[PDB]
Amino acid sequence: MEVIELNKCTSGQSFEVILKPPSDPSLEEIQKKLEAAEERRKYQEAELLKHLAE
Amino acid sequence: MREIVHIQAGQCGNQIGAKFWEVISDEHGIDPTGSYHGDSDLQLERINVYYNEATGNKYVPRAILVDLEPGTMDSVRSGPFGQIFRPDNFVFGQSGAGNNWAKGHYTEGAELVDSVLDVVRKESESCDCLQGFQLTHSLGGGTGSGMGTLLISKIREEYPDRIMNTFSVMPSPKVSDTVVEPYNATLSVHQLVENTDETYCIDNEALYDICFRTLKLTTPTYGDLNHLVSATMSGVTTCLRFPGQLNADLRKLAVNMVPFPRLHFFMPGFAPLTSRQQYRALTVPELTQQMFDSKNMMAACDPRHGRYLTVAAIFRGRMSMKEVDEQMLNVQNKNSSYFVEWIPNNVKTAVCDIPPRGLKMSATFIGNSTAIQELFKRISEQFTAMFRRKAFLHWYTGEGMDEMEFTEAESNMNDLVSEYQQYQD
Amino acid sequence: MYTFVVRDENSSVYAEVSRLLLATGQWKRLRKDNPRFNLMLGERNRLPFGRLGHEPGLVQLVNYYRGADKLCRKASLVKLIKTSPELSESCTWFPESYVIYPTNLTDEREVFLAAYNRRREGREGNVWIAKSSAGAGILISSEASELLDFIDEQGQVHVIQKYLEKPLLLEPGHRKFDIRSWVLVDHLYNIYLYREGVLRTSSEPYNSANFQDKTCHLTNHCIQKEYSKNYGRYEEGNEMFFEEFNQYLMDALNTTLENSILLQIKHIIRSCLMCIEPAISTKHLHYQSFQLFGFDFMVDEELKVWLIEVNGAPACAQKLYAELCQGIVDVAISSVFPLAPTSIFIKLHHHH
Amino acid sequence: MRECISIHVGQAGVQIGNACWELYCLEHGIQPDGQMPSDKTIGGGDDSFNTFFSETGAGKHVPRAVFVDLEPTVIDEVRTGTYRQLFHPEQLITGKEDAANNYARGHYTIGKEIIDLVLDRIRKLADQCTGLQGFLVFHSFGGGTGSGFTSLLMERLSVDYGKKSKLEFSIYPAPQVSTAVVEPYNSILTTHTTLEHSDCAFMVDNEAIYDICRRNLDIERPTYTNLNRLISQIVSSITASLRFDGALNVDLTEFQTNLVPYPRIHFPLATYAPVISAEKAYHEQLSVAEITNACFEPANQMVKCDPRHGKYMACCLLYRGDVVPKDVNAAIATIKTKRSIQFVDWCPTGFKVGINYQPPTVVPGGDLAKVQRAVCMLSNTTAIAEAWARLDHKFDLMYAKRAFVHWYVGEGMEEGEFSEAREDMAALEKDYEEVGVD
Numbered sequence A: 001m002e003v004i005e006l007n008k009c010t011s012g013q014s015f016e017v018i019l020k021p022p023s024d025p026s027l028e029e030i031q032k033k034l035e036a037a038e039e040r041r042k043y044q045e046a047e048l049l050k051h052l053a054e
Numbered sequence B: 001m002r003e004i005v006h007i008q009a010g011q012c013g014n015q016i017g018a019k020f021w022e023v024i025s026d027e028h029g030i031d032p033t034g035s036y037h038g039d040s041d042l043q044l045e046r047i048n049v050y051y052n053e054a055t056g057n058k059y060v061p062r063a064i065l066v067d068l069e070p071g072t073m074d075s076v077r078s079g080p081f082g083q084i085f086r087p088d089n090f091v092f093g094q095s096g097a098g099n100n101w102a103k104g105h106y107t108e109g110a111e112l113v114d115s116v117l118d119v120v121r122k123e124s125e126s127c128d129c130l131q132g133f134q135l136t137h138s139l140g141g142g143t144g145s146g147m148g149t150l151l152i153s154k155i156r157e158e159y160p161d162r163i164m165n166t167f168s169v170m171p172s173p174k175v176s177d178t179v180v181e182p183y184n185a186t187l188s189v190h191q192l193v194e195n196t197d198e199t200y201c202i203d204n205e206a207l208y209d210i211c212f213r214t215l216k217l218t219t220p221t222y223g224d225l226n227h228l229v230s231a232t233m234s235g236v237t238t239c240l241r242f243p244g245q246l247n248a249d250l251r252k253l254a255v256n257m258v259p260f261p262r263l264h265f266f267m268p269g270f271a272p273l274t275s276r277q278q279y280r281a282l283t284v285p286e287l288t289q290q291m292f293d294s295k296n297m298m299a300a301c302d303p304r305h306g307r308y309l310t311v312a313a314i315f316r317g318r319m320s321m322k323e324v325d326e327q328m329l330n331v332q333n334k335n336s337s338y339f340v341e342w343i344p345n346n347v348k349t350a351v352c353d354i355p356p357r358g359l360k361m362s363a364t365f366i367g368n369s370t371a372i373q374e375l376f377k378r379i380s381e382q383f384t385a386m387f388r389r390k391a392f393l394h395w396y397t398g399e400g401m402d403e404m405e406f407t408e409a410e411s412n413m414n415d416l417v418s419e420y421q422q423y424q425d
Numbered sequence C: 001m002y003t004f005v006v007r008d009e010n011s012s013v014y015a016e017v018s019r020l021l022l023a024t025g026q027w028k029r030l031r032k033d034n035p036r037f038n039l040m041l042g043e044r045n046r047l048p049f050g051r052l053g054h055e056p057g058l059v060q061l062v063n064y065y066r067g068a069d070k071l072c073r074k075a076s077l078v079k080l081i082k083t084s085p086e087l088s089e090s091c092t093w094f095p096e097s098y099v100i101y102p103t104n105l106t107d108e109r110e111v112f113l114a115a116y117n118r119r120r121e122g123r124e125g126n127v128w129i130a131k132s133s134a135g136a137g138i139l140i141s142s143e144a145s146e147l148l149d150f151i152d153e154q155g156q157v158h159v160i161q162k163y164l165e166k167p168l169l170l171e172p173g174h175r176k177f178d179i180r181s182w183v184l185v186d187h188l189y190n191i192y193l194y195r196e197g198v199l200r201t202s203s204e205p206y207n208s209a210n211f212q213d214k215t216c217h218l219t220n221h222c223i224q225k226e227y228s229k230n231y232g233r234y235e236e237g238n239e240m241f242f243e244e245f246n247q248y249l250m251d252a253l254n255t256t257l258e259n260s261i262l263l264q265i266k267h268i269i270r271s272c273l274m275c276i277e278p279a280i281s282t283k284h285l286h287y288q289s290f291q292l293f294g295f296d297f298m299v300d301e302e303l304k305v306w307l308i309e310v311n312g313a314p315a316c317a318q319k320l321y322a323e324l325c326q327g328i329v330d331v332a333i334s335s336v337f338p339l340a341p342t343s344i345f346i347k348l349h350h351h352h
Numbered sequence D: 001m002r003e004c005i006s007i008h009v010g011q012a013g014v015q016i017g018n019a020c021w022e023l024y025c026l027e028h029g030i031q032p033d034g035q036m037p038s039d040k041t042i043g044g045g046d047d048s049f050n051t052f053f054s055e056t057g058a059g060k061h062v063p064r065a066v067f068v069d070l071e072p073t074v075i076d077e078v079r080t081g082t083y084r085q086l087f088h089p090e091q092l093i094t095g096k097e098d099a100a101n102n103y104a105r106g107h108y109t110i111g112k113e114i115i116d117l118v119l120d121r122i123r124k125l126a127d128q129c130t131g132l133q134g135f136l137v138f139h140s141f142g143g144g145t146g147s148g149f150t151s152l153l154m155e156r157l158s159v160d161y162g163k164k165s166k167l168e169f170s171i172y173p174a175p176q177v178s179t180a181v182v183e184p185y186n187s188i189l190t191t192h193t194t195l196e197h198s199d200c201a202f203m204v205d206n207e208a209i210y211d212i213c214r215r216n217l218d219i220e221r222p223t224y225t226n227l228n229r230l231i232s233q234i235v236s237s238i239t240a241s242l243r244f245d246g247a248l249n250v251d252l253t254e255f256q257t258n259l260v261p262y263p264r265i266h267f268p269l270a271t272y273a274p275v276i277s278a279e280k281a282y283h284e285q286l287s288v289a290e291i292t293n294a295c296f297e298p299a300n301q302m303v304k305c306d307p308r309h310g311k312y313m314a315c316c317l318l319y320r321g322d323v324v325p326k327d328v329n330a331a332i333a334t335i336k337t338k339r340s341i342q343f344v345d346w347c348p349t350g351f352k353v354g355i356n357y358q359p360p361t362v363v364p365g366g367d368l369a370k371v372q373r374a375v376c377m378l379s380n381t382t383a384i385a386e387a388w389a390r391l392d393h394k395f396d397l398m399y400a401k402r403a404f405v406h407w408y409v410g411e412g413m414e415e416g417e418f419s420e421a422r423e424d425m426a427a428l429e430k431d432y433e434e435v436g437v438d
């Protein structure tokens, strides 16, 4: 039961007690994901308009 | 400012839509002239959802009245709130549709559709941010059925990413106008399966049985049936027209109510349904027991024959919200055999403080139940009863249709029934 | 209308509780995967406790205490008695035991042999019994070489404990036995002891000069009904109930079951359950737990009681299923889900 | 002094952010008009509170915050509420129609169109920071914006501010306060794409905040204002070290060092006490030992789970009010001999303690009573995995039937991203078990 690194200031204090010792995607790659999904939306919408045109 | 554009087409379409505006206009304090006169700011909070604001603080419904004959809309124009509508929004022909889906979808209707879309486009352009469209109509006639579905097809072409909801009166031989109603209903249902996000199924027989048996009306009239629809339509749009911790637009509701694109046909319901013992106070248990009772549901389908995919319940009035949660959780946890266990928490509840005119508190029920397949089964059986003998087909082949298109509509709905059946096991 | 689910179809016990529940006409059984339930008769292994107590409006109750495995596992119990101060390493009612891991895998190999060599040097009885939970696989021997080599041939953790060389033998027969007590612990962590106990007796005469034949040493109901040739002679099914065994102790030992054996049994049950209460108590938890236990005891020629093991999913005596299962519904289920005596239990009061 | 920029995404994030900055102002003595009488340096200074507030020449103290929502109804309250004067219009960003609870919609469809506008507004606050530490991102798991757009903002912040730490305050979905059936989908989608971009995340389960409001505050049906006022006390207790003088958790980097030894396991459990009803005439003030003993009761945890059946990887005690180290260690000792505190063998069995003498601030007319001492415990336990298990299970029930999947595909997402995100959660759950179970 030891207290280590005790810091004291006007607004409070803080310390550490030890009980027992132990034993990314680039910016380019994000554009491709966003656009890829925008292309799948465009394709899906195309097949709808192609359906409605038929 | 999430605006909705309303469209009512045909005889049934316009007489039901008329009463709907009569009901909500009373709830928002709008008089027959369009001037506000309520006593609460909640009445104007979301007023622009269904009304436009004109000069002099006038509120004009965002509604388009459509029909192939003048008769019905002449009645609306001279009805109670007839004056409140926008004159330019009456679009109608003179030939009529003769209860023929083909006349409304392909011939007569095709001649009038463009002018209707001109008014729709005009209302949308004035929308800050259009939520979507709602259509009232029947499926058994010619205009609301055939031209109504033609309108949805053309509205989806021009507004592909807007929500399309409908209140569709399903035909019933008990409350029937013509023998061809199964033909017309079968043709429209395929259009709705493809081009609507939410369709509230109202079965004219359920409306009749409620007036006769529950409401104690010896001889119901179409007006009587339309009182129920008006009140139900007011109930399900409460989430949209008034404030609350809801904050849900058409698309948000569709996302949580429709687990599969084709199975978007709902059973609506209302409570109380009291006969004239009408001033008796109703408790939350009674409101809840009745709202889930089949006799309070308007699809003429027994929910105990299928399973609920999702269920929404709206409570109106000043009541114990804690007591509301206790009762809903009592209906579920007492009959969890009727809710699919593969959609966690598929029963959602919403509360509103403003009760319908002349009621301390009401409850509206919106259920996406696989039992609705019985509705499509009835229609399909009656369709095949005639189409097997090609009875009355000449009315349609004379308008340019072919038998092949009837066979396809047949197959399309028998498929729709099969889909509802696989999700019930 | 209460709803429950069944997730252990092999539970002869709760199969009768589920049968009785429906008999009341007030409990409704749901699918084994419907989360909207009040009571769960869950599975033995890997019960998903973490998914309990999260359904709005539902007060949920399960028939297993999460963490009770510390008591119903052979090796766990040994570690619990030795490391827990409540029981201490000098606990007088538990045979000196050791946790021995197979060499093909902390471990107490050297500590076990230390006491062994001490006994071999002191002329004392040095007979041990090796066993594990993965057994039907038991070996009784007096040579440490044979005990350790048997565990190395296996692949699971084992425990070596002192074999009771002076067991109390019933007469006539000169035969060994064991006592099974059922203990129910409800959501409030009250400890109830079933008034009816069973002595699973060996139909073979005990023999201390031959541990190879494990028919007179192992009082298991399956070993006597399988490898014993006197099964069902003295008592029906090698099972003597408390009424008879009590009369025997009077005629033979001039004592009673309560004084000579039962006080120690109640004391052991309390010590074991109180010890782990802070670790498994569902008092301030989001769900509630209860569990039935089967305590197996040994009695020596000095009328001193020893704790063999604790069963977490124990069976029951065929003559006591009705009375007991109903008792589980009175104090464990209906106490939290009431319905529209002279208790068959003995409340062992304690401090929480 | 290094600055911290807070980002509030979606309805939950914005409403919670509103509750936090209201509290921050009452704690730092800032008035709704932005003026701060005690601040003797007019229009400048590198004080502790300046990590969250910049200063204008006119003495106004402006929060270093951004509010982003894909619909204006929630952020409009900020523009007209009590603290409208604190923010300027650039700080509040609003769309015209939300994501409809559709992750794919907020991340792809709508997010792609507004992501560059948010980054620009954030860069403006960054250009006002002489040494930005990182970001605090508040959002919900279930919202289409909170889940879908947050994960995109995180990916970009990792690109535009590589060496910057990112923390989360995420709202776990609870049925008692939601009508959304698809929130499990959103929660698992957003945790998958955010996991490698977040250094530390504090999950708050609405179910926990809900019960604490009814049990301790005697509120039959709590509102969002009740829930958020309480949540802002925990957030305030967790951010105080960054806004006040001190030596523990003085910068965002120290949250990862003190609480996350393994990167993917960066979801500490929060426990707060006491929470006392203000309507109580007067309450018996709890002691250092009692409130510390409450840190191990499951009731006052931000995520309902049983830490008794997990292993601790770290533990941080943040006290506020009349507390001295002597009492702390006295209560700690009493609790080690009465509780089940099993640590992982590859971590010391210790506690870092931070004390701030200024007791918790209470919003006038709120629900929480004024207490003389309170504590928030941050502990990284494997027990919090129970929450991932529950959530992942709901996901499996609906995805087995592909329910509601067409709404996500319809917005440009591939069905495979579902299973790809699920397999990640399966990996996340396996990690907790490798570190917690034996």
Ligand SMILES: Nc1nc2c(ncn2[C@@H]2O[C@H](COP(=O)(O)OP(=O)(O)OP(=O)(O)O)[C@@H](O)[C@H]2O)c(=O)[nH]1
Residues within 6 Å of the ligand: D009, D010, D011, D012, D013, D015, D016, D069, D070, D098, D099, D100, D101, D102, D106, D140, D141, D142, D143, D144, D145, D146, D147, D171, D172, D173, D174, D177, D178, D180, D183, D206, D209, D224, D227, D228, D231
């Ligand atoms: N604790 C708390 N939870 C909230 C609050 N507001 C919303 N939530 C939760 O957030 C979830 C819904 O997500 P929202 O934040 O409303 O959705 P969103 O981020 O605005 O995204 P959209 O779908 O586009 O509206 C539900 O589980 C709500 O319970 C709040 O103020 N406090």
Ligand SMILES: Nc1ncnc2c1ncn2[C@@H]1O[C@H](COP(=O)(O)OP(=O)(O)CP(=O)(O)O)[C@@H](O)[C@H]1O
Residues within 6 Å of the ligand: C095, C129, C131, C135, C136, C161, C162, C163, C164, C165, C176, C177, C178, C217, C218, C219, C220, C296, C298, C308, C309, C311
């Ligand atoms: N140290 C010991 N001394 C004397 N007998 C012992 C003993 N260890 C085990 N036994 C005998 O073994 C039997 C119990 O074995 P154990 O309980 O360890 O295996 P098991 O758990 O598979 C049987 P059950 O669980 O049904 O009681 C008792 O009848 C007892 O006679």
Ligand SMILES: Nc1nc2c(ncn2[C@@H]2O[C@H](COP(=O)(O)OP(=O)(O)O)[C@@H](O)[C@H]2O)c(=O)[nH]1
Residues within 6 Å of the ligand: B009, B010, B011, B012, B013, B015, B016, B097, B098, B099, B100, B138, B139, B140, B141, B142, B143, B144, B145, B169, B170, B171, B172, B175, B176, B177, B181, B204, B207, B222, B223, B225, B226
């Ligand atoms: N509920 C209700 N149903 C109606 C009303 N009028 C007609 N119907 C039903 O609608 C079908 C006839 O369609 P109708 O609207 O008259 O045809 P249309 O005007 O050409 O579209 C039949 O099934 C009628 O039972 C009405 O006012 N109320």
Ligand SMILES: CCOC(=O)c1cn[nH]c1
Residues within 6 Å of the ligand: B175, B176, B177, B208, B220, B221, B222, B225
């Ligand atoms: C509901 C009222 O219905 C009628 O009046 C009717 C229906 N068929 N013919 C007349």
Ligand SMILES: [Ca+2]
Residues within 6 Å of the ligand: B111
């Ligand atoms: Ca013509």
Ligand SMILES: [Ca+2]
Residues within 6 Å of the ligand: D039, D040, D041, D042, D043, D044, D045, D046, D055
């Ligand atoms: Ca200053």
Ligand SMILES: [Ca+2]
Residues within 6 Å of the ligand: A024, D158, D162, D196, D197, D198
């Ligand atoms: Ca990073």
Ligand SMILES: [Mg+2]
Residues within 6 Å of the ligand: B011, B012, B141, B177
């Ligand atoms: Mg007609």
Ligand SMILES: [Mg+2]
Residues within 6 Å of the ligand: C309, C311
């Ligand atoms: Mg055993």
Ligand SMILES: [Mg+2]
Residues within 6 Å of the ligand: D010, D011, D069, D071, D098, D143, D145
């Ligand atoms: Mg929102």
